[PDB]
């Protein structure tokens, strides 16, 4: 129902930006195993700093 | 003998005078079937979203 707002033609391809799809990739790895032992498999960007 | 074998080189029929030619035909068929499937694989990947 949300995608129907976009009205994306079936024949066009490239339905979603690659990184938006990689977000699902990282999310599924996190869901399968949230431990760092499985996080280590794919790239991430960590934002860390002083309080 | 070198001259006669050159005449052998010239004529392909003189190579398949005895009809045991499975070797050459089978090799050609293997290579061409691999090309067939290689192109069909990309075509079907285009069917999955390129429609």
UniProtKB/Swiss-Prot annotation, chain A:
Q: What superkingdom does the record give?
A: Eukaryota
Any idea where this protein resides?
Answer: Mitochondrion intermembrane space
Q: What does this protein do?
A: Constitutes the soluble short form (S-OPA1) generated by cleavage by OMA1, which plays a central role in mitochondrial inner membrane fusion and cristae morphology. The transmembrane long form (L-OPA1) and the S-OPA1 form higher-order helical assemblies that coordinate the fusion of mitochondrial inner membranes. Inner membrane-anchored L-OPA1 molecules initiate membrane remodeling by recruiting soluble S-OPA1 to rapidly polymerize into a flexible cylindrical scaffold encaging the mitochondrial inner membrane.
Q: What protein am I looking at?
A: Dynamin-like GTPase OPA1, short form
**Annotated gene:** OPA1
């Amino acid at each position: 129902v949300l995608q129907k707002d976009d009205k994306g033609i079936h024949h066009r391809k490239l339905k979603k930006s690659l990184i938006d799809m990689y977000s699902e990739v990282l999310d599924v790895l996190s869901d399968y195993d949230a431990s760092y032992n499985t996080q280590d498999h794919l790239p991430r960007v960590v934002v860390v700093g002083d309080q | 003998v070198k001259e006669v074998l050159e005449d052998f080189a010239e004529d392909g029929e003189k190579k398949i005078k005895l009809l045991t030619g499975k070797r050459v035909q089978l090799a050609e068929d293997l290579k061409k079937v691999r090309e067939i499937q290689e192109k069909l694989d990309a075509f079907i990947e285009a069917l999955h979203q390129e429609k």
